[PDB]
Amino acid sequence: PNRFDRDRLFSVVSRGVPEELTGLLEYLRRTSKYLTDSAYTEGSTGKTCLMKAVLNLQDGVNACILPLLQIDRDSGNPQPLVNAQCTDEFYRGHSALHIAIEKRSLWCVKLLVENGANVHIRA
């Protein structure tokens, strides 16, 4: 167990099980390869892992997003995976914080804004 693909991270974050995110931890450290890159995401839209996780939420509580954030911030680059968004023709500038507002959840908005998601991004 050294590698996943984008699909299995998407599947895991869809379910929302934190007990597996530990693996993603080491999968961030090696090969100097990060989640903000174009490989751990789709290529058509640009939907990253955080967006995919948010697009399905257990009523109003999740357990996979937060650990993913402190894992990413430990070795992430310029964009804290929260300042990054889609580069699609249909969706340009649309980031995860817009999704969090759209799904009517105070908690996730709180985490995103306190973790470094600046509210100045044009969708």
Curated annotation (Swiss-Prot):
N-glycosylated. The modification Phosphoserine is found at S11. This is Transient receptor potential cation channel subfamily V member 2. Calcium-permeable, non-selective cation channel with an outward rectification. Seems to be regulated, at least in part, by IGF1, PDGF and neuropeptide head activator. May transduce physical stimuli in mast cells. Activated by temperatures higher than 52 degrees Celsius; is not activated by vanilloids and acidic pH. The gene is Trpv2. ANK repeats lie at residues 2-44, 45-91, 92-123. Belongs to the transient receptor (TC 1.A.4) family. TrpV subfamily. TRPV2 sub-subfamily. Homotetramer. Interacts with a cAMP-dependent protein kinase type II regulatory subunit (PRKAR2A or PRKAR2B) and ACBD3. Interacts with SLC50A1; the interaction probably occurs intracellularly and depends on TRPV2 N-glycosylation. The lineage of its organism: Eukaryota, Metazoa, Chordata, Craniata, Vertebrata. It is found in: Cell membrane; Cytoplasm; Melanosome. The chain holds residues 67 to 189 of 756 of the full protein. Abundantly expressed in spleen, placenta, skeleton muscle, lung and brain.
